[PDB]
Coordinates of C-alpha atoms and ligand atoms in Angstrom, one line a residue:
X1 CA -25.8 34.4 -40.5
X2 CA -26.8 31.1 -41.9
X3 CA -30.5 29.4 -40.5
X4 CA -29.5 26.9 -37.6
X5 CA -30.6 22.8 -38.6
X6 CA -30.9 20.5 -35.8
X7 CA -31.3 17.0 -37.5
X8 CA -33.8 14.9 -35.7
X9 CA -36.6 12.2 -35.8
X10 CA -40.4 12.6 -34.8
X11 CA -42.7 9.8 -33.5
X12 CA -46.3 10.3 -32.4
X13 CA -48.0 9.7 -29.1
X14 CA -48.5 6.2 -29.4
X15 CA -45.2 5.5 -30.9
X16 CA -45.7 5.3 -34.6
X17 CA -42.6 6.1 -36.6
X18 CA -42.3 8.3 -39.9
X19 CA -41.1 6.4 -43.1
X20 CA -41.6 7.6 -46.8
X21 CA -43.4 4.8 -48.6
X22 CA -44.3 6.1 -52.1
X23 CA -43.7 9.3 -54.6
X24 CA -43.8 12.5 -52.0
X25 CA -46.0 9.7 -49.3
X26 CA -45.0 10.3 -46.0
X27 CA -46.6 7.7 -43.5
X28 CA -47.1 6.3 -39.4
X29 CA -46.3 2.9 -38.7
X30 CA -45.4 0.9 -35.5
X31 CA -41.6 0.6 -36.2
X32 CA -38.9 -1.7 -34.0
X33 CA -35.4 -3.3 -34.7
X34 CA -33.8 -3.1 -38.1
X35 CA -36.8 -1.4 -39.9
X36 CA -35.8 1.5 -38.0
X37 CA -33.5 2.6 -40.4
X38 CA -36.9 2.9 -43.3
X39 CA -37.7 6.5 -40.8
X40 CA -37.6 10.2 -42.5
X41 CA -34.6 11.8 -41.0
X42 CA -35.5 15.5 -40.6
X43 CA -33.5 18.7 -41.0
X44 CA -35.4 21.4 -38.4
X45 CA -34.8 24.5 -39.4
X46 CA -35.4 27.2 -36.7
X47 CA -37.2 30.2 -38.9
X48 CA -38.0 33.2 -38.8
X49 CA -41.9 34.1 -37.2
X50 CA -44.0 34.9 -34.0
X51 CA -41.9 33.0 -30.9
X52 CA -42.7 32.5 -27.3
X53 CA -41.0 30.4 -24.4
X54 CA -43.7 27.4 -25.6
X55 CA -44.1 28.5 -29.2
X56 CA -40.7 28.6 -31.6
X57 CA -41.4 28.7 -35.6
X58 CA -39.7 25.6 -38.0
X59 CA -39.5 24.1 -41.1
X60 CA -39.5 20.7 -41.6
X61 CA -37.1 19.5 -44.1
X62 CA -36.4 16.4 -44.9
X63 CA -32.1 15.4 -44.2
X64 CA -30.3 16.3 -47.5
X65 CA -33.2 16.5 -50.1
X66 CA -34.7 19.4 -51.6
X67 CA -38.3 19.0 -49.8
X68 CA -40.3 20.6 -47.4
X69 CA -43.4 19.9 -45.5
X70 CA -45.6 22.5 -46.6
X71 CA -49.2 23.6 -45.7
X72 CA -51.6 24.5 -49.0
X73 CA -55.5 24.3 -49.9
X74 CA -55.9 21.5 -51.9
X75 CA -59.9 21.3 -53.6
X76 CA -60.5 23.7 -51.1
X77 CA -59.6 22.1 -47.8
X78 CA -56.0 22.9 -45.4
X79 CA -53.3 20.2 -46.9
X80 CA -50.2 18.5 -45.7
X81 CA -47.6 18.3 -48.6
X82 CA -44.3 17.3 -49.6
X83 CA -42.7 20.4 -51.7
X84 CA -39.9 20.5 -53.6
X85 CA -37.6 24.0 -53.5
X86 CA -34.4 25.3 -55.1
X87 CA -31.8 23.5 -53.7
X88 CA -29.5 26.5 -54.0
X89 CA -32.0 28.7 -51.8
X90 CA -33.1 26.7 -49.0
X91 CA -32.9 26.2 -46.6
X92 CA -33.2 29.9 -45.5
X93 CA -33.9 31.5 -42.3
X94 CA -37.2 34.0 -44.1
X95 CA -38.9 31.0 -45.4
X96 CA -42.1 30.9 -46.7
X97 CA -45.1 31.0 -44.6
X98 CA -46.8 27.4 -45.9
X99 CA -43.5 25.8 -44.6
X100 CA -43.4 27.3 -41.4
X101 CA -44.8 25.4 -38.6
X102 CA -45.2 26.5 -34.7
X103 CA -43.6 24.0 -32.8
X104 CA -45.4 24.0 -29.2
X105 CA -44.6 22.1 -26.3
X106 CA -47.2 20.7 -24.0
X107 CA -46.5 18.8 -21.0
X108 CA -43.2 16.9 -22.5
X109 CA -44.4 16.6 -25.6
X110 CA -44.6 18.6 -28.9
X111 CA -47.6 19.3 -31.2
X112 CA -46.4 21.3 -34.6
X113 CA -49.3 23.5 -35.5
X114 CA -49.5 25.2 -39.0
X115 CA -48.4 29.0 -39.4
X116 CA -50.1 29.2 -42.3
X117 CA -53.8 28.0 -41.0
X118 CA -54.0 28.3 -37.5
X119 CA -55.2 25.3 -34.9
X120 CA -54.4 22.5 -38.2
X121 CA -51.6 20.2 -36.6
X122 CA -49.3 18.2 -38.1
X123 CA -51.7 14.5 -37.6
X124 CA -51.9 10.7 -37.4
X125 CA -54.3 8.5 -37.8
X126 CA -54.4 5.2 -35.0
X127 CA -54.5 2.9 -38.0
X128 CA -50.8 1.3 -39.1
X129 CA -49.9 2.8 -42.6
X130 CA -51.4 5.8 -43.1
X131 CA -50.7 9.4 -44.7
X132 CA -49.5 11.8 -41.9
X133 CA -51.8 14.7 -42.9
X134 CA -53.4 18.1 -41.5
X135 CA -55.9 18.1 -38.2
X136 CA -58.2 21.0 -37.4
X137 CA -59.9 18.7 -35.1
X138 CA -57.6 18.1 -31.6
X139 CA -58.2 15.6 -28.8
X140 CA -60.4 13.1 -30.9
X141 CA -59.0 10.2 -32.9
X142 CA -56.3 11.8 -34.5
X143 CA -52.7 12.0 -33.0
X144 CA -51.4 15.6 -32.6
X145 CA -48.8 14.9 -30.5
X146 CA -45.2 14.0 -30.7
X147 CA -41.8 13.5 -29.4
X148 CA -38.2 14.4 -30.9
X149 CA -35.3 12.2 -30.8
X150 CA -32.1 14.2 -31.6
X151 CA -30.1 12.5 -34.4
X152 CA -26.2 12.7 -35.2
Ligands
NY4_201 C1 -46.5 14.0 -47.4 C2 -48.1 14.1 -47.2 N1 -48.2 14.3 -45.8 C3 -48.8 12.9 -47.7 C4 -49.9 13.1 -48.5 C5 -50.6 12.1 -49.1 C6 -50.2 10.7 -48.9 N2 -50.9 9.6 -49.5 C7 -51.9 9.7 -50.4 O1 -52.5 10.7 -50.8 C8 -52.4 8.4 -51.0 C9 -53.6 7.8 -50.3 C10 -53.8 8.4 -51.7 C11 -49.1 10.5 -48.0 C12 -48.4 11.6 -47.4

């Protein structure tokens, strides 16, 4: 059958919203009112992977544009990116390992952890206006956590 898309919004712990800013620049900023518009709408894709009650494999797509959060080395180091696919292939339910990510929920709230390079989360910084990136480091000054709000 075809993959099953839930469209939906993401805002980390301490309420920073996700807006694109900038040529493949995805960024956290303290949102409210009108402005709320400016947020990345994203298409979840629920893919194929290792699953548990807690632990449930997606891509991150964003609504009706051929991109993709996707996980890559970049001069040497585990990389958040924007990635541009085929819009006749995607989105798929077998998709590619650097877009998968493992959606986990911890007490009511949801950290997305890479497939591809295990314990690097999906991150903000506490600054305003700052690249969403990668975190191997948890529980320090960057924001691994996150709630959904479900979107029509
Ligand atoms: C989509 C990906 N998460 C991402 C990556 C990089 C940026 N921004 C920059 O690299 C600018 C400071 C030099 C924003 C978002």
């Amino acid at each position: 059958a075809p993959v099953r898309s839930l469209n939906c919004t993401l805002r980390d712990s301490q309420q920073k919203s996700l807006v694109m800013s900038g040529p493949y620049e995805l960024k956290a900023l303290h949102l409210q009112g009108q402005d709320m518009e400016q947020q990345v709408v994203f298409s979840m894709s629920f893919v194929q992977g290792e699953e548990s009650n807690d632990k449930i494999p997606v891509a991150l797509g964003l609504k009706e544009k051929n991109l993709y959060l996707s996980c890559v080395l970049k001069d040497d180091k585990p990389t958040l990116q924007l990635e541009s696919v085929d819009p006749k292939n995607y989105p798929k339910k077998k998709m590619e390992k650097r877009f998968v990510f493992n959606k986990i929920e911890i007490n009511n709230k949801l950290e997305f952890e890479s497939a591809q390079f295990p314990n690097w989360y999906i991150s903000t910084s506490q600054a305003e206006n700052m690249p969403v990136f990668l975190g191997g480091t948890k529980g320090g000054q960057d924001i691994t956590d996150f709630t959904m709000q479900f979107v029509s």
